[PDB]
Design a protein around this nucleic acid. Structure first.
Ligand SMILES: [Ca+2]
Ligand SMILES: [Ca+2]
Ligand SMILES: [Ca+2]
Ligand SMILES: [Ca+2]
Length: 575
DNA sequence: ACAGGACTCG
DNA sequence: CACGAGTCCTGTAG
């Protein structure tokens, strides 16, 4: 029943200076993907245009790229990237309903117009799954079905903009959408489109080496088990360990990592199995899985950054996930050798905040002892050891620093004696003694942890530095485990989330500076608390001064932000 | 197709 | 594997 014009040519009344716009890409991965239809709703009416028509039309292309022609959209980054791949610029997106819904309630999991519309009780639009199907079944329907769905989405966007903006304003989140998340979305769209170049021969050679090691370790494991079995099967493995070999059952059977490390002394087989799984992971995911997704023409990978998924305001990255490339262990770290700059004589430059979370905590809690440590640029883990174990700097042993570091991680995650006990393999009572010593040395952090839990209870939510919000309705649960989990969220979310606001802001500031300096440098990746760029070799020295400074200056805290930076011919070398 | 259990990362 | 993510394999399922 929704009225529109199924236009067959583009007309001027479709080029109003305010419209809701739908540029539909049905494939889940939108990189180089078809645009299946276009709907426009504005003061003059509702329109559907076939894309071969509209995108071949120079006036429509000019309206798309005209920043004074304001568009309201859902997931403008998807339309933007798919248009970049056809060489078309999208500008003037003044309202993005996906990002508005995300700031209003990240727990909604809003992934289509219908889910966002639900939040204001607008129901005159169907969910995308209902129209398109699921997986194998996911298909573009016939024109009359397609066209009505797209026009309904655009009409929903047109109606919904105002109440969303009203709520964002009451929440004091209007600048967060307009000055942070929307500008960031255009930056992420450039990053994704630029992609990261992969050295595929280097990956194939690492793969060959791994297949050889895996073979030797597999053979060893069979020798030690006196049997053939599927090592990748936690079921078959648990039979081999706890039944055939009679190993102690400390925690059907669990063969997790924590468990196998405690088991390692009882039998040669355990360490071999842990080494197998680690290599098997490099092999299947970071060699095989990565090669499946590099473009065979350009040899680039083009991640998709999900800007509206995490509950704390962080990004995620998929297909591939470039925020979880190995680094911890040397053999996996070599994978980073396959990530190279995209031009001859360019280099990779990586800059990263040092302990941004603890620095945010110092600021938010205003703990005198913590703020002073950072003002002195002390090694925060050594200092925490000195305070909780009551010794001088030179009396801090490595084991002591290891344990104080675990307390610091605990503190930011929202501490509990059970979680620190499990992390450190000590008793609950032992872990509680450390936590008590910690709070005696940082009473501001204690005050803060108490206050933020009671504030989560009175307000129903907690906020970050730039007014991001997470609702915590389980904070009043009569169930202990559920309530504890919400209390940890209350303690952690302002910290993890504020660190996410700062880095997002640094990205915006950085991109403005690069353009103001007309440097060729550009962002490739964000990894939570670090930015990775490529640039000509000749820009390096300017980058060393410009990047850290932008990152350090993104916000003003009561403690300084510290940034280390490195560069080299591959991602691996930018260390 | 989907969950559980493993691994990766900040 | 505490807080926050994502991908691959196995085995059970339809
Ligand atoms: Ca024309
Ligand atoms: Ca980092
Ligand atoms: Ca400062
Ligand atoms: Ca790191």
């Amino acid at each position: 029943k929704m009225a529109f014009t199924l236009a067959d040519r583009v007309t001027e009344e479709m080029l109003a200076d305010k419209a809701a716009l739908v540029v539909e890409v049905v494939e889940e991965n939108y990189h180089d993907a078809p645009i299946v239809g276009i709907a426009v709703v504005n003061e003059h009416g509702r329109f559907f245009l076939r894309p071969e028509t509209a995108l071949a039309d120079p006036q429509f292309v000019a309206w798309l790229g005209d920043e004074t022609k304001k568009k309201s959209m859902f997931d403008s980054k998807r339309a933007a990237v798919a248009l970049k791949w056809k060489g078309i610029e999208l500008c003037g997106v003044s309202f993005d309903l996906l990002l508005a819904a995300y700031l209003l309630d990240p727990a909604q999991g809003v992934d289509d117009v219908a889910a966002a519309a639900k939040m204001k009780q607008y129901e005159a639009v169907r969910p995308d799954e209902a129209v398109y199907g699921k997986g194998a079944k996911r298909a573009v329907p016939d024109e009359p079905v397609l066209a009505e769905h797209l026009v309904r989405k655009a009409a929903a966007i047109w109606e919904l903009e105002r109440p969303f903006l009203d709520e964002l304003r009451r929440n004091e989140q209007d600048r967060l959408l307009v000055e942070l998340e929307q500008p960031l979305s255009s930056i992420l769209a450039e990053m994704e489109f630029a992609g990261v170049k992969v050295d595929t021969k280097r990956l194939e050679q690492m793969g060959k080496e791994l297949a050889e090691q895996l073979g030797t370790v597999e053979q060893r494991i069979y020798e030690l088990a006196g049997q053939e079995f599927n090592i990748n099967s936690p079921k078959q493995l648990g039979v081999i360990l706890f039944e055939k070999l009679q190993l102690p059952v400390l925690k059907g059977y669990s063969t997790s990592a924590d468990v196998l490390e405690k088991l390692a002394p009882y039998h040669e087989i355990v360490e071999n199995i842990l080494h197998y799984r680690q290599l098997g992971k490099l092999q299947s995911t970071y060699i095989e899985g990565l090669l499946k997704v590099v473009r065979p023409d350009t040899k680039k990978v083009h991640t998709i950054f999900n800007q509206a998924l995490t509950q704390t305001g962080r990004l995620s990255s998929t297909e591939p996930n470039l925020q979880n490339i190995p680094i911890r262990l040397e053999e996996g770290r070599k994978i980073r050798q396959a990530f190279v700059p995209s031009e001859s004589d360019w280099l990779i430059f990586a800059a990263d905040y040092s302990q941004i979370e603890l620095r945010v905590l110092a600021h938010i809690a205003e703990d005198d002892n913590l703020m002073e440590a950072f003002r002195r640029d002390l090694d925060i883990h050594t200092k925490t050891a000195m305070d909780i174990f009551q010794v001088s700097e030179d009396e801090v042993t490595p084991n002591m620093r290891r344990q104080a570091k675990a307390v610091n991680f605990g503190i930011v995650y929202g501490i509990s004696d059970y979680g620190l006990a499990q992390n450190l393999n000590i008793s609950r009572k032992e872990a509680a003694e450390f936590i008590e010593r910690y709070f005696e040395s940082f009473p501001g952090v204690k005050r803060y942890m108490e206050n933020i839990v009671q504030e989560a209870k009175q307000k129903g939510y907690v906020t970050t530095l730039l007014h991001r919000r997470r609702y915590l309705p389980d904070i009043t649960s009569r169930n202990f485990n559920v309530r504890s989990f919400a209390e940890r969220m209350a303690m952690n979310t302002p910290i993890q989330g504020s660190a996410a606001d700062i880095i997002k802001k640094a990205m915006i500031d950085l991109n403005a500076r690069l353009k103001e300096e007309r440097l060729q440098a550009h962002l490739l990746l964000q990894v939570h608390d670090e930015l990775i760029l490529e640039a000509p070799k000749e820009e390096m020295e300017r980058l060393c001064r410009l990047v850290p400074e932008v990152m350090e200056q993104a916000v003003t805290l009561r403690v300084p932000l510290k940034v280390d930076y490195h560069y080299g011919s591959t991602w691996y070398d930018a260390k």
